[PDB]
Amino acid sequence: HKPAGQFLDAAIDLLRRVRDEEADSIEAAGTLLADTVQNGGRLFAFGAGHSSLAAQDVVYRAGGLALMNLLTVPGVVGIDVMPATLGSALERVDGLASAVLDSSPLRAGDALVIISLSGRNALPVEMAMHARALGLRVIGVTSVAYASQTTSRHASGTFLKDHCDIVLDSKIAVGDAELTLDTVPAPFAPASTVVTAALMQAVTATAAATLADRGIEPPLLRSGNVDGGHEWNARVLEQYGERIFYRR
Amino acid sequence: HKPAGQFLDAAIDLLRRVRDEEADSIEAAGTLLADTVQNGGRLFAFGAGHSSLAAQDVVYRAGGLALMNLLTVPGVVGIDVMPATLGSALERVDGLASAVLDSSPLRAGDALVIISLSGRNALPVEMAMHARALGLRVIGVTSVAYASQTTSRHASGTFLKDHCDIVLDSKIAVGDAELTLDTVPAPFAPASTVVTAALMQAVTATAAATLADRGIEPPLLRSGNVDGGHEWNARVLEQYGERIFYRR
């Protein structure tokens, strides 16, 4: 078959694995987010580089929770950095994650989602360890297969998944590459953003439904271009503005 | 069923539609990118806000083309902007797209991918119109269903798809929301980033295979953590450094 359809089939199969193998962990994570909102805590999401894309996909998003904030490490917010190679170097800088966390409004009881495919670099591992040391609840979105087939690059020798309250397995095989061509020597075509974005949307949707089930109107963001959307968004900001950090 | 699995099934079905309905347009777009590389032109990708995530997913990416550059409009690179509401306002600023394009290294014959779900705002429409006026080839990644059910917000009254050499339909139904709960009044849970990232990876993989089929070694990026990856990446930068703008 053609490369487009092989790649799309590989992404579909990964989404089936997530659906069929992570349904309980997704509900657990959604429940944790719901518990955090109900108990008055704050919600944050982080990833480095391309792992940042899934974190951004649930922040200030139509049909997403108004309460989800982005935790930003300058230089690794997407590949928005010059040179782009610096972003990869920053993932190995000990102390950066703690500088970001200590400066943030995150407190004990808050919930932080950490997206890291390999879970082996210093930044996301330190991110999780120090987050827990501050009393945060940590949800990891990580391919656990990496932990059994690679060595940690953190001084502790451990992986992201060793420091999460909840681990969501993003399934991607080591190498993040779904296609192989007889012509091409190296595998190519990564699906990890497809899968991590879908996984994150499932988690946040679950948290939103769980709050509804408890008789709590979920603070979802609405399109401005549907009547009442701006009225709705203003009420949510006024109700939850103290836990929303991307606007005032 | 539970919200996670319904959402994941909705994403799987969208990826099947893309697979089954866009295979020819994906190949055409991949071919255009291949033709652009072979003929000595430059490759760029743009989207505004959450449409930016799919553009970033093919830039400086392991298993992706080294030659794909990000076209950055300050303020709409992801939701990385304070306040996040500014990003939405910027999509309606006439003249921004032309300021970005004229300042870029893009020339006649180069290829530009424009990701816009609705294709109705001033920024992406002006982006496409002015890109074509400069002699660029434009590939749009857009949900065409929006053009038949909404009004354009560009002064011309037209949509992104009216100004593309190739249009890739991202299928998302108007509203970008896949779940409905009896409890919740408004639909929620958007899959548009899932779908646009997968669509973009298919296009770039197709371009890479097409170059291979022509006896051209595809300038893919390799992981640094596989032996020879850095040697490979350096040779590609040295060969194509004049068309790579995220590093020197």
Curated annotation (Swiss-Prot), chains A, B:
SIS domain span: 33-217
GO biological process, one term: D-glycero-D-manno-heptose 7-phosphate biosynthetic process
Database matches in NCBIfam families: PRK02947.1 (NF002805)
InterPro entries linked to this entry: RpiR-like_SIS, SIS_dom, SIS_dom_sf, SIS_GmhA/DiaA_subfam, UPF0309
GO cellular component: cytosol
GO molecular function terms attached to this record: carbohydrate derivative binding; D-sedoheptulose 7-phosphate isomerase activity
Classification via PROSITE patterns: SIS
One Pfam family here: SIS_2
Similarity field: Belongs to the UPF0309 family.
Disulfide bridge map: none
Protein name in the entry: UPF0309 protein SCO4393
Species of the source: Streptomyces coelicolor (strain ATCC BAA-471 / A3(2) / M145)
Top-rank taxon: Bacteria
